[PDB]
Every structure is written in C-alpha cells, then in structure tokens.
Ligand SMILES: [Hg+2]
C-alpha cells in the first residue's frame with residue numbers, strides 16, 4: 001500500500017541558534033505559502049510569503065544556516081495572496097512581480113549574486129512601483145507569468161487583461177476580446193451580481209503560445225496569444241455523469257491542473273474525486289478518461305499541489321506517466337502518486353505513502369525503546385535534541401505566554417505540557433504548502449514554517465515490509481516470517497523489550513561473562529526478562545507459524561542480502577564540493593529510519609532464539625552476527641539522539657573522498673548513499689582498545 005516514507009528536514013536542526021546569523025531586511029517604499037525554485041547555479045532557493053502577504057523571505061535550501069536569508073518587507077499586502085505574485089529568473093536575476101492591494105504593480109529585481117553573497121546592502125533599483133491599469137473598479141485576482149516582458153492578469157469578474165513590457169520597466173494593458181459577458185442578457189446572470197462570475201482558478205502556458213485556463217465552473221477555455229482570441233471552450237463536467245445534485249463551483253484559485261508534455265490532467269469537484277486527463281494536439285484538447293480518487297472518511301481533503309511528470313521507479317514496471325498529488329486536511333497531509341500504465345488513461349494504480357515520519361510515529365505509538373529514560377532534565381535533553389532549537393524555543397514561548405511556568409527542577413507536570421506543545425508546534429511548522437521536484441525525481445514538500453521541509457523517500461524492500469506489516473496480502477516468505485515475528489514481539493511491553501535489548505548488549509560488553517555458554521545467557525535473559533511476561537497462548541501462535549518456515553534459508557536472505565549491505569566499487573555518489581546542509585540532514589534522518597527498522601527486526605529475531613530451542617551451534621554464526629548488528633544499531637541510534645550534529649560530523653568525516661557531503665539526484669542514488677552509510681556503520685570496529693575507550697562507551701551507552 002505505502003511505497004514512500006516521510007523524512008522531515010529542519011535545516012537548522014544541527015545548530016543552537018534557531019535563526020541564521022546572516023539575515024538581511026530590505027524595505028520597500030512566512031507561514032502562508034512556500035516553494036522552492038531551481039536557478040542557474042543549480043542551487044535551490046526557498047521563498048515564503050508571510051500570512052499577511054506583506055513579507056517575502058528568501059534563503060538557500062542547501063545553506064540555510066550560514067547562507068543568507070533575505071526578508072523583503074512590503075508597503076501593503078498583495079491583492080490576492082501568492083496568487084497575485086510571480087517569481088521567475090530572467091537573466092542572472094530573481095524577477096518578482098506583485099500586484100499589491102491598493103492596485104500597484106511592484107517589480108522586484110534581486111541579483112542572483114546578492115542572494116548568495118555576504119552583502120547586507122543592495123545597490124541600484126531593486127524595485128519599481130507602477131500603476132498600469134485602474135484596479136479600483138474591476139479587481140484582479142490572479143497574476144500569470146508568460147515571458148520576461150509579457151504576462152496576463154485574471155479578473156474577479158472574468159476578464160483577462162494583458163500586460164506588455166515596452167522598455168524594461170513599464171507595462172501597458174493589451175486587452176483581449178471578451179463576449180462571455182453577454183450572458184447577462186439572460187434572466188440567469190446579472191453583471192451587477194456578486195455571483196454569476198466564472199473567473200479563472202488555474203492557468204498553464206502551453207507551447208509558449210496557448211494559454212490553457214480553468215474557470216470556477218470547470219470550463220476549459222483555451223486562449224491563443226497570437227490572436228488574443230478565445231480558441232476553445234470545453235465543458236469539463238458534461239462528460240462524466242451529469243449530477244444535477246451538486247457540482248462544487250471551485251470557490252477559490254488553486255492547483256487544479258498541470259501538464260507534462262502534451263498531456264494535461266484536471267481536478268474536478270465530485271466529492272473532491274475527479275482527475276480528468278486528455279491530450280492537447282495540433283489547437284485541440286481531447287478527452288481520455290476520468291480517474292476518480294481513492295479518498296474516504298467523508299473525503300475532506302483539499303488539493304495543495306499536484307505535479308504530472310515522467311514515471312518513477314515504483315513497484316510496478318507497467319508505467320507511462322506519474323501524477324504526484326498532495327492533499328491536506330488541517331495540518332495533516334496526504335501524498336499519493338497516480339501511476340498510469342499505458343497511453344490509454346484507463347489502466348492505472350494509486351500509490352500511497354506514510355504521512356508521519358518514523359520518529360513521529362514511534363513517539364505517538366510508544367514504540368521507542370532507545371531514548372534514555374529517568375530524570376526530568378533527561379526528558380528535557382531528549383525533547384530538545386529530538387525537536388531542534390527553532391521548535392523547542394517556540395514551544396517554550398507558547399508556554400510562558402500561556403502562563404505555564406516551570407515550578408522546580410522536577411516539575412513533571414510541566415514537561416508533560418512541553419510534550420504536547422512541541423508536538424503541535426512541529427505539526428504547525430510542518431503544514432504542507434507545495435511540491436518541489438528536487439533533482440530529477442525527488443518528491444519534496446515545502447512547509448509553512450521556514451527552514452522546514454519534508455522529503456518523501458521511496459522505500460527499500462525491508463522498509464516496505466516494516467511499513468506494511470498489517471496489509472501485505474501476499475508477500476515473500478521473509479515478509480511472512482518477519483510479520484509473525486512482529487506478531488509476537490508486539491504483545492510484549494516496552495520495559496520488557498528494553499530489558500532484553502540491554503541483555504543482548506551485555507553479551508557483547510561481557511557483563512554476561514564470555515565464560516557462559518550461549519544457551520546459558522539465553523537462559524539468563526529468559527528468566528530475568530521474559531518469564532511471566534507474555535501470554536503462553538501467543539507463544540503457541542508464534543511456535544506454530546514459525547514451523548512453516550525454512551528458517552535457515554529465510555535468515556540467510558535477511559542477514560546476507562537484506563540487512564547486510566554491499567561492497568562498493570564506488571557507485572557514484574556525486575561528491576559535494578561544498579557542505580550541503582540539506583542532503584546532510586536528509587541523509588542522517590534516512591540512515592536513522594533504516595537502522596531503527598533494522599533494530600526492531602534484529603531484536604525480534606534474536607528474541608526467538610532465546611525462546612525456542614534453535615541449535616546454538618547451527619545458528620551460532622547467525623546468532624553472533626545478529627548480536628553484533630544489534631549492538632551497532634543500538635549505539636548508532638543512541639548517538640543519533642545524543643547529538644545529531646556531532647554524529648553527522650563523525651559520520652561524514654568517516655568517508656574520505658566524500659568529506660564534504662554528497663549530491664543525489666534520483667532515488668537510486670539516494671538509497672545507494674544511505675545503504676552506503678549503513679555499511680560504514682556495520683563495518684565499524686567496536687573493540688575498546690584501552691580503559692579510555694571502555695570508559696567512554698560505558699558512560700555513554
Ligand atoms: Hg508497497
């Protein structure tokens with residue numbers, strides 16, 4: 001069911017200061033919208049339009065901390081939020097146009113250099129206010145770029161203004177012919193009506209000439225800018241079952257369509273479930289099929305952004321095109337990928353993904369065995385480390401503001417609050433805003449709170465089993481084997497599992513004397529940890545299911561194919577010339593998910609060995625390989641939550657030729673690099689070469 005997982009990235013996580021030191025504020029005489037644009041230098045720039053549409057913010061995706069974020073203040077809000085705003089890169093510059101509320105037409109010119117410089121000053125004219133047309137009468141609501149000098153304006157009443165640049169700073173309104181207003185001669189529409197309007201809600205420029213548009217009544221009017229004449233006028237709805245009942249005339253500009261080559265998909269309102277996709281050809285738009293959506297619980301999701309593109313590397317080869325869809329329902333999000341098999345838009349499959357990160361799911365479902373327990377300040381370090389300074393401090397802000405102050409060092413009552421706020425602030429910071437296709441195929445989501453992004457990563461085999469235990473109808477032997485192993489381990493409690501994990505570490509550390517026989521240690525672990533701690537009924541279920549497996553074969557594939565990665569004859573992981581903060585955290589978080597998953601599997605398998613009579617001699621190899629993998633897994637997970645920055649540092653300064661970071665462009669490269677870091681973790685030495693190293697480990701582990 002779910003083929004992608006969520007990796008949350010907070011670009012300032014590794015730092016104490018929850019804000020770059022280099023922040024410049026330009027004034028003219030972001031939690032409502034955010035997106036990422038690629039530039040000439042192959043760098044990614046992020047921008048956020050504040051809630052009030054009065055502030056625009058810029059910062060580099062790959063260097064959020066040391067890089068410069070630029071806050072561009074504005075005289076007043078734009079007319080209609082980010083819809084009356086545009087940002088394209090002309091020639092070595094970020095050209096920003098923004099029809100303001102008053103009716104002005106601000107023009108921002110930000111030098112590509114300035115964006116990556118150290119400069120806290122800007123020379124010349126980076127902005128030009130202008131009053132082309134009078135918007136006091138016919139108020140506009142949607143600005144649309146087309147070219148450096150030409151771009152249209154969409155009006156609330158339905159009219160399309162033109163806007164041609166003559167010199168390099170002045171714009172003149174080149175009006176298009178419009179007779180759609182004559183429908184007022186009907187007893188069904190009045191020009192003076194607050195309704196009746198059929199304004200554009202989506203628009204896409206095709207072959208630099210045709211301007212495909214979508215009205216609130218889902219009419220696909222196609223404009224030819226060579227004629228400035230309405231060339232087509234299709235009625236998207238008539239084709240599907242004509243429901244007299246109710247058709248939700250789109251009541252707001254949104255992302256209802258996007259086109260790849262000559263294919264075009266459209267989102268029609270039918271319980272919020274229609275994705276029509278025909279093809280343009282010559283100009284002619286021609287139907288193909290209506291693909292419903294698989295949404296339930298009333299179907300209360302709103303489209304956030306959709307992106308039609310070249311296929312991906314999903315679990316089904318039968319692919320032609322891919323539609324990445326981002327829905328939202330409050331601060332909760334949903335990302336899916338519509339995979340169309342053949343050129344006939346009639347055979348397709350809906351691919352879903354996990355919408356909470358593993359770190360989030362483990363916290364929610366009390367599935368975390370690694371994080372140290374105890375003290376109240378211990379729980380403070382845990383959260384602070386877990387959330388990052390930007391969020392932690394924002395939560396301690398909301399606490400005092402609400403008069404929730406820490407009584408004493410051990411005010412557990414307090415910490416209990418922090419938990420919930422942190423969780424909520426994160427959820428808030430994480431509200432979905434748009435999609436950015438990082439590289440060639442990396443699905444990325446940009447959040448409401450600046451410096452927070454979410455990468456949706458294609459799952460590896462093992463990950464898929466993990467994320468689909470309660471679903472895979474079919475699945476391989478190993479899948480079925482792991483599932484039944486989980487079936488039993490899930491019935492135990494955290495305190496029991498932790499006590500067991502600790503015992504496995506003692507075998508490696510020696511607290512469980514090397515003098516003992518394997519059977520003796522497993523005996524010790526059982527009596528001290530498992531006895532009287534589980535339902536004998538469940539052991540039977542486990543014992544039974546286990547007998548249907550060729551255990552040796554299965555464990556061999558798990559331990560020698562799935563878990564233990566492979567040797568590298570350097571399989572190209574673009575060596576980064578400069579520190580890439582984005583991929584850094586994306587890599588560390590990904591590495592942490594994979595090892596966490598490995599850790600649960602490993603523990604579960606080890607568990608069966610201390611419960612049943614498996615020849616400690618036959619499986620002697622496997623048992624010691626698992627105990628060794630478990631130890632490394634634990635340690636790594638332990639260092640991850642003890643100090644993310646330091647870990648990333650020692651972990652990236654471990655690889656020689658990749659001492660600065662990496663640059664991955666597709667999912668394969670990404671997965672490869674992660675699997676790569678995994679090897680560094682499984683091949684690392686864990687022998688303490690002196691009392692110094694032993695102290696270190698004892699003190700930390
Ligand atoms: Hg799957």
Ligand SMILES: [Hg+2]
Pocket residue numbers: 430431432433445446447452453454
């Ligand atoms: Hg997000």
Ligand SMILES: [Hg+2]
Pocket residue numbers: 014644645646648649
């Ligand atoms: Hg770091």
